[PDB]
Design a binder for this molecule. Structure first.
Ligand SMILES: Nc1ncnc2c1ncn2[C@@H]1O[C@H](COP(=O)(O)OP(=O)(O)O)[C@@H](O)[C@H]1O
Ligand SMILES: Nc1ncnc2c1ncn2[C@@H]1O[C@H](COP(=O)(O)OP(=O)(O)O)[C@@H](O)[C@H]1O
Ligand SMILES: Nc1ncnc2c1ncn2[C@@H]1O[C@H](COP(=O)(O)OP(=O)(O)O)[C@@H](O)[C@H]1O
Ligand SMILES: [Mg+2]
Ligand SMILES: [Mg+2]
Ligand SMILES: [Mg+2]
Lengths: 538, 191, 520, 50, 548
């Protein structure tokens, strides 16, 4: 019928559209499920320009590789919204949507309508929230213990790199959120940490710095790199004029006025710089071991560097926009644009400032702050792809530890929630059915589709999933009768059940929320889709 | 593919600031420094800006040496006008030169009487428009019947400057590309 | 010697009408399964690459380019139905197709003229509006409990029936905010804002009366939490405005160039001092802001946000009551907005969001929708447009009618009784209108999975007893009255459907020749 | 698991890059110099040719 | 997003193969595909029907009003339309009458089925509905029959038979076309009254030879046959009475050569001298036994030698060429001769009887005639059909085949069993089938109802082709049947039918005095094969094609 409207159109309806949706989901599942867990494989995103990059997150794999199929675009957009708000759990979303469409399509072939199947997923979804809010546990984060944050960070960073690099990098994640905390307002910013890309000794030789680190060096050699006590000063106006907004020109009457009109531009430079020199000696004159550094966002005149070089003034330029907020948090200063009003109160303080010449560039290091409300992480590496790999590891690990402070509740990992949720969604007696023999088909499909996560971890480790889950099933049968609450996991070293709380594996509360909510919505709408169409004007 | 290029290519230094809050700073400021350098080159090249009413001895220098410019092949276009006050098209073309001179300061606009230009020149062939570049004649244009004749407008003259390679197609100063502020205002409301 | 550059050949006679009526049937077949509560979903592949998952009729037709010109008259009916009401778009297409499909074997078989059919449809349309007026009844408009089930009627087809308890409260508070006193309900969809935020959970949502901005403050010293904010709207840029006269300055003395940049600082100084004449706390501007002007506003605590859209400034004006003033000299205490509160910037890693809340009856709000993907956010957003679209007509007119095939069946039963009573040449196409209303009940039954031949046979005998509120359930397919369940829609949707269906049939039935090749 | 029907192997060097091992290339390089040498062979001497 | 997956697992079959299921309105399209060529049949039924030009790829044109004939040349793509082609082809082969009806009825059963499938009736119940309607339809055709022939040969009775048949195909004038057939039917029939013998009739007996020129009024009925032959030796008017004799030989009139390497062999001059004269004396000696029997014309089956021809025209023996099998067999049935391949003496009992053999100019070419007389009648007569346009000769010739095919309908059944024509037989079944729907319960009643609505096409078509408004002519005719059989016997409301030309209102002045009727045997198989055409199209829910 569609060909009569547009001969150049196409349409798959009610059997070919269903196979496309399920095969595209299973095809996306079979490729991308291998990255799940610590034993997952590394992918090399080699584009046409030859750029190499190692990663295991499903967000960046699907972002660089354009998706041709229309179904997998909807799943990639779900991983984008998952990675956007949360930053973790993209591999669980594509596996749940792939398994839900697989388990649902098993029943659609048996002659069941898609409507009551999706109705069972929503009742099963709401039943999981009534199971999740009872399954979570509350802890007191006021103590600020380091042992809990390390093992929670170790659980997230083991799924990115091997063990020896995780042990070196897992203190860097815990050191990121030391001072950034507010009990009353409950405000916690993630963007204040600064990720610098640079080539140095090795990835395993990185370290945490308390204060700020800028990528700009001193232009003149005469200024001192070592400064024992520095008072920062924030500038935003450009000392070097780029252009005059109102058009004008110097028409000199004689040759004697040429150098005077050249000195007219020198007066406006000396006018705004004289207050800077007066600001230096206002604190104390002839004070050794006390420097004065200036951080400007816009450019600096090279003619003016001689003025800063004579008085031993460190000047940096072309700074970032978000760094202006980070200066006052680290050094404790105050941001200023003009130079009309100046005082020693607005100035910050720093205990140590130094520079290091690495290659054809120089990096400025500002450390030894009194009460800094921010910090930075140097991403050192032996190549170009390790920087992006460690950058994705930190950007995915910062969200896992930051959610512990946003909400005190935390779920144990190692597939404990998926295994425990399977039994609870078996038999809904008279709680929430809605109809006889209709909703229960979807309850069974949703319960069986959640257990693919612990099985996928076992497939990557190289053991049998049914054998290692049989003892997990036998363990929880006696745990209910033993009168003891016990959470079981999946250990991939020996192939035997385990205890997450004892060993140290955890998952964030918001990961499982948006993953189950996003997967159930996409799995529902794709089952409701009965026909694919295309139309347009080339 | 073009959707990513339109963010930077289709915005000047004044329009690039619109994407300061939306796009990344390093992606935007990297291109603003590039476009800022291009603006500085045009200011240094702005050696002209009014019609040079010359005379012949000088032609052998103003028209041709200029056409060499720096001789870095810094060529300079030089539009000559063999004016003839008795003709109606000549006075129209003189107005277009002064109007274009105020806008395109890098291009040299030259004018001279036609009777003083060539020995016994045909008055019927006037007004004549010659375009020099690196000493070579790029275009020996005849009377303005090609450009509408008596009904010649500023839009037709600016279009001719793009054909000879004197001004880029996507230049913001051309009236074809320089959309009115009221036009862009209606586009944003209806978007 | 062609004599015609535009289709010298012609397709005339009855074959052009077969292509017209068959094309009008084909556009209805691709959306026949898109009706009722058990309706399926569709996917469209635009050439730009932006996919969309839709079941509403208007979104299906507008994104499908059709080469057949006679079919395009059917494509635009959902566009007409959308801008007029915004609900009931699918019923107009299938109803117009059944009228054209039922009226097909009369020129072929009976050879009755089209203009006689045009007279028959108008008298049927006159009687259709008469019996719809008889079947409709009024209800109380101020009862919030009654408004929930009417909004739930259109929501039952869409995906968000599972959250119908939340969606009714989400839409009822929003439509009442923009509503005001003065066609007695002059509020417009343009004032209602709906910002789509990927991520979160759809269960967690609230109707905040404010304007949600998608940007951060320009300077880090500014406080993000204000207890008693004072909004001031501006159109002038805080930057130095460049004059359009192209003024050039002849600098001869040495102090002139320094004085110009000092006058630049003095102008921004004098300009910022006039902002502080009314001591505001929150400033909004639709243009850029220079870094020089940021420092002088720190002493006053005037939070500035830049590059705000023109429509958002109007929405900020109606909420806080501030007046948009371009120049900085005309700021008065009355110009400064008041009765604002709860200014807070919630930190989210994607983008910075700033909230607003109140304590000139025009008002506005911003519905922050949370979900799992950008495409389903458009689905829930379009359901919000359908959620308030069904609520406008019950507020405009108190009239109200049933639905679910019952109101369409009442038209067919009343027309069928008087069709035999007419006894004229126009009674043959007059019967086609009575048979054309049977597709909707039928469609609903077919999608539900029932047997339409016997379910509709007893429905004829049921309506013959003298009742009108008896419909067809969409889940199981009973002949139970809709008073128990509560399926009710406004009267304006069914009025616009029969009018647009009849008026579209009159346009397409009077075509006999097809030509092309004009290239206007 | 695989993306498509087949997967052709990668050439290590770029397509069209000439390379060779063994003693054949250094003999070809020596013969190339001798080929240039023969042009200047009869030129050497007072009785040589231009 | 930019491109679909384009139907995966499509490599199971070839790219050219396509499936067409019942969904997506494709069964409605197949009904619309029937509607394309069905409307072509609307303007070709009835006496006012319009012929059709069909230009083949070779250029051979046939202009015609008959369905079965027109559908042979058109190459069809849709398989459901080909069911109608072979259904009408079956109608032409068996009965040779009522082919438009097969097309117009079975197409309308699919038309009214478009409404039934759209309502929601299952396809299995649709076949059960028409089958139960078919058993009642064929039952009532035997009940409402009136009149019978009861005599194989009569001048006035054949006017009631042939005239309503040829009235559809090339109506023209009624008397000049009907008398050519009724005169020829009486010649070929073995009358043999008061003997108890079984009648016999062959379709291949009556055959029409096309000759250009002249006019339709100058057509005559020839007792014998005719070919466009030329006598070799001499032409003879044969004014001698005392009838001649006929001898038919299937072998050539020449020396029976040896099948295996017939070659001369002459060892000496004595055989060389006698071999030339031996062939002359041998051929002459065989003609003596043939000539003494009094034969004056011999029909040869193949090429005749010159030496044999020299002795045949010596005694004035005519020679006729018939170089084919069927052309030689048809001539023996006229004179009643038994051929023998031997070159000996024909037997006297086997010799045929032909009085005269004339050669005259009809179409400008030489033709040989074999007119018999009232005494010693013969069979397999021909009809000299004169006309101006060769295309009109083709359609009038097939009208004689339809008329000759109608004469076949009297031999097999017990009698004539004529029905009222002019839509009266169709409109009567509408009331009877409508009453049958009211007597039966169940959901099949709508199938019985729409089966009656499909029979309205015959009066609707005849009213449309006659230049009248069908909205006024059709319901005016229903008033004759809405006044159903009162208490008085001998009701004459059954003969009311449509009228092509004349009085207003249209119920025809009976089909009676008009002497137009229809055959029962045509209506039986036509409704049977038309229902099978709709059954096979409606029963199938999936169609598969290849290469297009
Ligand atoms: N060391 C571990 N042992 C067992 N299970 C683990 C371990 N680390 C992670 N997991 C499981 O892997 C799942 C996903 O974790 P992770 O790989 O960090 O996210 P993503 O799959 O998005 O990269 C979690 O639900 C968790 O149960
Ligand atoms: N559960 C239900 N039971 C009976 N009728 C329903 C049900 N859900 C929807 N309907 C009917 O289907 C119609 C659908 O309307 P809506 O989806 O808002 O626009 P459209 O009619 O264009 O699809 C409603 O008018 C209503 O009468
Ligand atoms: N002169 C006439 N008046 C009324 N009816 C006629 C006349 N001629 C023909 N008819 C009717 O038109 C019908 C046409 O039958 P048709 O199918 O064309 O016969 P055929 O099989 O020879 O083509 C006949 O059944 C007959 O009843
Ligand atoms: Mg993770
Ligand atoms: Mg709707
Ligand atoms: Mg006939």
């Amino acid at each position: 019928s569609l060909q009569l409207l547009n001969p150049k159109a196409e349409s798959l309806r009610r059997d070919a559209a269903l196979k496309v949706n399920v095969t595209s989901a299973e095809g996306l599942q079979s490729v991308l499920e291998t990255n799940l867990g610590p034993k997952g494989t590394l992918k090399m995103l080699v584009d046409g320009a030859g750029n190499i990059k190692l990663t295991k997150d499903g967000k960046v794999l699907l972002t660089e590789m354009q998706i041709q199929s229309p179904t997998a675009v909807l799943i990639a957009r779900a991983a984008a919204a998952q990675d956007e708000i949360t930053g973790d759990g993209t591999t669980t979303v594509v596996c749940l949507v792939g398994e839900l469409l697989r388990q649902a399509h098993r029943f659609i072939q048996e002659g069941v309508h898609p409507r009551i199947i999706t109705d069972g997923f929503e009742i099963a979804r709401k039943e999981s929230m009534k199971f999740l809010d009872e399954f979570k546990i509350s802890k007191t984060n006021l103590s600020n213990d380091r042992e809990f944050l390390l093992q929670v960070a170790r659980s997230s960073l083991l799924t990115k790199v091997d063990a020896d690099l995780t042990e070196v990098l897992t203190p860097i994640v815990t050191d990121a959120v030391l001072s950034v905390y507010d009990a009353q307002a409950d405000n916690l910013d993630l963007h204040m940490v600064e990720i610098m890309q640079m080539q140095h000794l090795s990835p395993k030789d990185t370290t945490f710095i308390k204060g700020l680190v800028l990528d700009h060096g001193g232009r003149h050699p005469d200024m001192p790199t070592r400064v024992k006590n520095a008072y920062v000063l924030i500038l935003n106006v450009s000392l070097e004029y780029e252009k005059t907004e109102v058009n004008s020109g110097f028409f000199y009457s004689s040759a004697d006025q040429r150098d005077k009109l050249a000195a007219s531009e020198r007066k406006f430079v000396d006018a705004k710089l004289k207050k800077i020199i007066d600001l230096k000696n206002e604190v104390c004159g002839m004070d050794p071991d006390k420097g004065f550094v200036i951080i400007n966002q816009k450019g600096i005149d090279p003619m003016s560097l001689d003025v800063f070089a004579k008085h031993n003034i460190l000047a940096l330029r072309r700074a970032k926009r978000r760094n202006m907020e980070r200066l006052q948090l680290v050094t404790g200063g105050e941001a200023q644009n003009s130079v009309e009003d100046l005082s020693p109160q607005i100035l910050g303080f720093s205990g140590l400032v130094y520079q290091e010449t690495i290659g054809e560039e120089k990096f400025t290091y500002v450390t030894e702050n009194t009460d800094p409300k921010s910090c930075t992480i140097l991403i050192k590496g032996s190549t170009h792809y390790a920087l992006a790999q460690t950058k994705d590891a930190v950007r995915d690990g910062l969200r896992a530890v930051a959610n512990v402070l946003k909400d005190k509740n935390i779920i144990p990992g190692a597939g404990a929630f998926y295994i425990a949720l399977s039994r609870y969604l078996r038999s809904a007696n008279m709680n929430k059915l809605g109809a006889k023999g209709k909703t229960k088909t979807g309850i069974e499909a949703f319960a069986e589709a959640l257990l693919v996560i612990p099985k996928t971890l076992v497939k990557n480790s190289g053991f049998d999933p049914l054998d290692v889950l049989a003892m997990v099933e036998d363990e929880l049968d006696d745990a209910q009768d033993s009168d003891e609450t016990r959470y079981v996991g999946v250990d991939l070293n020996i192939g035997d059940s385990c205890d997450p709380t004892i060993e140290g594996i955890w998952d964030s509360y918001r990961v499982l929320r948006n993953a189950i909510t996003g997967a159930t919505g996409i799995a529902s709408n794709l089952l409701l889709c009965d026909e694919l169409l295309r139309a347009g004007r080339s | 593919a073009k959707q990513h290029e339109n963010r930077l290519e289709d915005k000047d230094l004044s329009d690039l600031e619109e994407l300061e809050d939306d796009e990344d700073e390093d992606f935007l400021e990297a291109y603003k420094i590039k476009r800022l350098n291009e603006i500085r080159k045009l200011q240094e090249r702005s050696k002209f800006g009014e019609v040079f009413h010359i005379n012949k001895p000088e032609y052998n220098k103003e028209v041709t040496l200029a056409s060499q410019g720096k001789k870095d092949d810094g060529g300079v276009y030089v539009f000559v006008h063999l004016s003839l006050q008795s003709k109606l098209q000549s006075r129209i073309l003189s107005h277009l030169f002064q109007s274009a001179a105020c806008k395109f300061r890098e291009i040299k606009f030259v004018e001279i009487p036609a009777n003083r230009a060539i020995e016994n020149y045909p008055e019927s062939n006037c007004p004549t428009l010659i375009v020099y570049y690196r000493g070579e004649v790029i275009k020996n244009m005849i009377t303005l019947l090609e450009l509408g004749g008596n009904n010649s407008k500023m839009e037709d003259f600016e279009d001719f400057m793009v054909k000879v390679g004197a001004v880029a197609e996507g230049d913001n100063r051309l009236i074809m590309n320089r959309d009115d502020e009221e036009s862009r205002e209606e586009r944003k409301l209806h978007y | 010697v062609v004599f015609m550059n535009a289709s010298q050949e012609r397709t005339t006679g009855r074959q052009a009408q077969i292509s017209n009526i068959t094309a009008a049937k084909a556009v209805a077949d691709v959306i026949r399964t898109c009706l009722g509560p058990k309706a399926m979903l569709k996917m469209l592949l635009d050439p730009m690459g932006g996919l969309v998952l839709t079941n509403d009729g208007h979104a299906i037709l507008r994104e499908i380019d059709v080469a057949h010109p006679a079919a395009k008259s059917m494509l635009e009916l959902s566009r007409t139905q959308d801008e007029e009401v915004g609900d009931g778009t699918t019923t107009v297409i299938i109803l117009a197709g059944e009228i054209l499909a039922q009226c097909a074997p009369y020129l072929i078989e009976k050879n009755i003229h089209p203009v006689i059919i045009i007279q028959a449809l108008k008298k049927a349309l006159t009687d259709a509006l008469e019996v719809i007026k008889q079947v409709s009844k009024p209800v109380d408009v101020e009862n919030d409990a009654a408004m929930k089930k009417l909004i739930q009627a259109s929501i039952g087809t869409k995906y968000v029936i599972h959250w119908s308890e939340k969606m009714c409260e989400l839409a009822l508070d929003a439509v009442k905010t923009v509503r005001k006193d003065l066609n007695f309900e002059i509020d417009i969809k343009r004032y209602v804002r709906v910002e789509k935020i990927p991520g979160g959970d759809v269960l967690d949502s609230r109707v905040l009366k404010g304007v949600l901005l998608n940007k951060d403050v320009v300077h880090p010293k500014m406080s993000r939490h204000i207890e008693n904010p004072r909004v001031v709207l501006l159109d002038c840029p805080l930057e130095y405005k460049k004059g359009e006269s192209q003024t050039n300055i002849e600098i001869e003395k040495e102090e002139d160039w320094n004085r110009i940049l000092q006058i630049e600082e003095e102008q921004v100084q004098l300009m910022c001092e006039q902002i502080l004449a009314v001591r505001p706390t929150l400033v909004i501007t639709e243009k850029g802001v220079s870094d020089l002007a940021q420092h002088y506003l720190l002493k006053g605590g005037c939070s500035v946000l830049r590059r705000v859209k023109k429509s958002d400034n109007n929405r900020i004006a109606r909420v806080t009551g501030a007046t948009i003033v371009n120049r900085v000299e005309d700021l008065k205490e009355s110009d400064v907005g008041t009765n604002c509160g709860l200014f807070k910037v919630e930190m989210i890693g994607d983008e910075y969001f700033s909230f607003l809340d109140n304590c000139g009856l025009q008002k506005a709000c911003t519905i922050m929708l949370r979900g799992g993907s950008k495409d389903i956010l458009n689905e829930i957003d379009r359901n919000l447009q359908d959620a308030m679209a069904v609520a406008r007509n019950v507020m405009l007119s108190p009239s109200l009618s049933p639905g679910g095939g019952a109101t369409e069946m009442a038209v067919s039963v009343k027309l069928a009784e008087k069709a035999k009573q007419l006894e004229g040449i126009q009674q043959w196409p007059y019967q086609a209108v009575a048979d054309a209303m049977e597709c909707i009940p039928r469609t609903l039954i077919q999608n539900a999975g029932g047997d339409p031949i016997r379910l509709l046979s007893q429905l004829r005998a049921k309506h013959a007893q003298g009742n009108f509120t008896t419909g067809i359930d969409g889940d199981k397919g009973k002949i139970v009255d809709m008073v128990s369940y509560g399926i009710w829609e406004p009267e304006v949707i069914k009025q616009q459907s029969v009018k647009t269906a009849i008026e579209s049939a009159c346009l397409l039935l009077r075509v006999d020749d097809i030509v092309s090749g004009v290239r206007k | 698991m695989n993306f498509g029907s087949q997967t052709p192997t990668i050439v290590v060097l770029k397509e069209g890059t000439d390379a060779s091992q063994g003693k054949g290339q250094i003999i070809s390089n020596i013969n190339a110099c001798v080929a240039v040498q023969e042009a200047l062979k009869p030129t050497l001497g007072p009785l040589g040719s231009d | 997003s930019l491109r679909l997956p384009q139907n995966p697992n499509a490599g199971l079959f070839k790219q050219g193969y396509n499936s067409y299921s019942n969904a997506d309105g494709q069964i409605i399209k197949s009904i619309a595909a029937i509607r394309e060529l069905h409307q072509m049949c609307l303007t070709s039924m009835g006496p006012c029907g319009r012929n059709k030009i069909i230009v083949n790829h070779l250029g051979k044109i046939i202009i015609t009003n008959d369905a079965a004939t027109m559908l042979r040349e058109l190459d069809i793509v849709h398989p459901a339309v080909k069911v109608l082609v072979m259904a009408t082809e079956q109608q032409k082969i068996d009965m040779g009458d009522g082919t438009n009806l097969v097309m117009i009825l079975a197409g309308e059963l699919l038309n009214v089925s478009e409404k039934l499938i759209s309502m929601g009736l299952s396809a299995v119940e649709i076949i059960q509905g028409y089958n139960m309607a078919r058993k009642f339809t064929l039952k009532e055709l035997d009940e409402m029959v009136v009149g019978e022939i009861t005599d194989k040969n009569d001048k006035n009775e054949l006017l009631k038979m042939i005239k309503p048949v040829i009235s559809s195909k090339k109506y023209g004038s009624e008397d000049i076309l009907s008398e050519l057939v009724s005169e020829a039917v009486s010649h070929v029939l073995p009358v043999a009254q008061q003997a108890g013998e079984i009648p016999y009739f062959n379709v291949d007996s009556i055959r029409v030879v096309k000759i250009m020129g002249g006019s339709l009024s100058n057509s005559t009925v020839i007792k014998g046959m005719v070919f466009n032959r030329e006598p070799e030796g001499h032409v003879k008017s044969l004014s001698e009475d005392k009838k001649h004799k006929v001898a038919v030989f299937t072998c050539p009139l020449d020396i029976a050569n040896t099948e295996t390497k017939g070659t001369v062999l002459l060892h000496n001059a004595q055989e060389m001298l006698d071999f030339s004269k031996g062939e002359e004396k041998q051929i002459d000696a065989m003609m003596k036994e043939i000539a003494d029997m009094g034969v004056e014309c011999i029909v040869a089956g193949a090429g005749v030698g010159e030496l044999a021809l020299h002795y045949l025209n010596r005694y004035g023996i005519l020679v006729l060429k018939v170089p084919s099998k069927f052309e030689l067999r048809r001539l023996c049935r006229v004179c009643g001769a038994t051929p023998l391949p031997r070159l000996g003496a024909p037997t006297p009992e086997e010799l045929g009887l032909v009085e005269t053999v004339k050669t005259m100019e009809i179409g400008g070419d030489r033709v040989t005639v074999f007119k018999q007389e009232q005494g010693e009648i013969s069979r397999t007569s021909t009809i000299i059909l004169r006309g101006a346009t060769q295309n009109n000769l083709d359609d009038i010739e097939r009208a004689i085949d339809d008329g000759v095919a109608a004469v076949k309908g009297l031999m097999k059944p017990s009698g004539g069993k004529l029905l009222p024509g002019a839509g009266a037989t169709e409109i009567e079944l509408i009331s009877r089938i409508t009453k049958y729907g009211e007597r039966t319960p169940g959901l099949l009643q709508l199938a019985i109802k729409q089966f009656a609505v499909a029979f309205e096409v015959v009066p609707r078509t005849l009213a449309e082709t006659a230049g009248l408004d069908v909205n006024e002519v059709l319901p005016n005719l229903y008033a004759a049947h809405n006044v159903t059989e009162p208490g008085a016997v001998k009701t004459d409301h059954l003969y009311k039918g449509v009228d092509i030309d004349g009085e207003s209102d249209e119920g025809v002045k009976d089909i009676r005095e008009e002497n137009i009727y229809d055959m029962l045997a045509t209506k039986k198989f036509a409704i049977n094969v038309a229902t099978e055409a709709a059954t096979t199209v409606l029963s199938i829910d999936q169609i598969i094609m290849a290469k297009k």
